[PDB]
Design a protein around this ligand. Structure first.
Ligand SMILES: O=c1[nH]cnc2c([C@@H]3N[C@H](CO)[C@@H](O)[C@H]3O)c[nH]c12
Ligand SMILES: O=c1[nH]cnc2c([C@@H]3N[C@H](CO)[C@@H](O)[C@H]3O)c[nH]c12
Lengths: 154, 154, 154, 151
């Protein structure tokens, strides 16, 4: 028995209130599906401005977590999405990880008409049916008709 | 020198004035080193708001050029850096491509004291000496003492 | 039972989870100081992409509330802070309103070294002791040693 | 007669020397005395802690003493200092002119290409006459900046 591993990428650890109120409900949503959630702010233990001697080790721990996970769950909220989440999203695409995006932000920050965001954030997703991997609410995370559930059971 | 391939990832194509006045001087500086420059805005015909039936091909073209290149020259100006540049930069790190960063913007948009930006942008760079890969002037691109020159002669 | 009015500018209404979990604790902390809180998302019914005919109404509602308040409490989280918050902040500075800033985000997104953000966000604040108007935690709003309590006590 | 040119173009050394002068020339060609803050305040590098407040009050007084603002609202999202100086110009009833040649959309609505609060000082109808999408439109006679000088 080995549960699937999801790297939960988000900018929510940068804010004290967001870290304590927004991440735990998302973590619970994924693990009600049996997932082992790798949350980088708690794992790599970054709670304030990372010191000069600590910044490389945090980057390497996030680099290694992306290499050793099965899928990424990228909170792509904000205008624009957080640049650290994007670096790790591109690493997950190049390494053929399962890709899932989350944005409950109704603002559109896009360079095209087909996607709500920059089109490169969707390069790792199919041309038709990418919306199945695009979650717009925390309640939607556990939908048995969406891609994350079908990736665990399929 | 070897005629290496550089993928020039930048947001300068989104603005009419920047595509005309800012991108050509950077392309000329890279070509002055004997580099084959893959500039995606002209190489993939990203002229304006990408149509819906065209966005998936623009994404996959950027993705293929990152896979088939030798290195990436990421213009990481802005607060924060462009999310499309950040995705393409994440792909290059995971594919073990050469990494070179460009920022002549003097604003600091960082989460740490070591690096001037989010530390994940430097994950593919060495712990010591990453400054040699970090360019803060167009004129600094053709310096022998910087990593892009040494990369060509090795 | 005279009661000072504070306009609470934040980007938190753009995300479903942020509007539900982050704003109520902040409104609570202000109301516990006897403050009267005008919250634009609650007052304007802006719950998704505003219609074309509805967008100008929202614009004039955010505008009149700033003009008729006694002070603004600006949530200036994010890299960079929300541009609508920044417009409403400059209005309050221009109208000699009381200014209070909130940021529990530890990222530095600044053009200088004195302030943790762009220097113009502190133009309406004193050159010395501006930190007294700068809140970095929800638990800090109650502090009688900080400028919000003092502004309420004359 | 006086336009304050709010832009983030002074933050990049390449952008300050290549992008701002062409915009300054067009505004002056219409007959406007341009107030460019990065040059007017002769400061362009991570402002010394002892200088940052002075730079803030200098531009704060420039928006108070100008006749209108020309705000380069390019980028996703637009620069925060530009937006602060914009909201001041709106509260002080100054003339409002916006410039965005960036073809990316970053709005919270459908009518306006950006956050609807950048257009609070513009009319509900015909706000697009104040919205410039290219440098070769600054000198357009059918646009609000020329009509603003002709009474
Ligand atoms: O200071 C930090 N501490 C921990 N993780 C990160 C990261 C990585 N990038 C993402 C946020 O930028 C986050 O999900 C994490 O994997 C950037 N900066 C920090
Ligand atoms: O180095 C500077 N010199 C002059 N003004 C500014 C500012 C002020 N804030 C705004 C930031 O874009 C800018 O347009 C100007 O009004 C920031 N940095 C500088």
């Amino acid at each position: 028995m080995k549960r699937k591993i999801i790297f939960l990428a988000s900018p929510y650890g940068f804010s004290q209130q967001q870290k304590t109120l927004l991440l735990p409900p998302i973590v619970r949503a994924l693990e009600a599906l049996g997932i082992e959630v790798w949350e980088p702010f708690a794992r790599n233990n970054q709670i304030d401005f990372s010191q000069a001697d600590w910044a490389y080790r945090v980057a390497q721990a996030d680099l290694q977590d992306v290499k050793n996970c099965d899928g990424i769950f990228a909170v792509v909220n904000g205008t624009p999405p957080d640049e650290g989440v994007m670096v790790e999203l591109g690493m997950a695409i190049a390494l053929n990880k399962a890709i899932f995006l989350f944005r409950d932000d109704f603002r559109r920050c896009s360079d095209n008409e087909r996607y709500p965001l920059n089109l490169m954030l969707f390069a790792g997703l199919p041309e038709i049916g990418w919306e199945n991997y695009y979650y717009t609410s925390v309640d939607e995370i556990q939908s048995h008709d969406k891609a994350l559930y079908k990736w665990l059971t399929g």
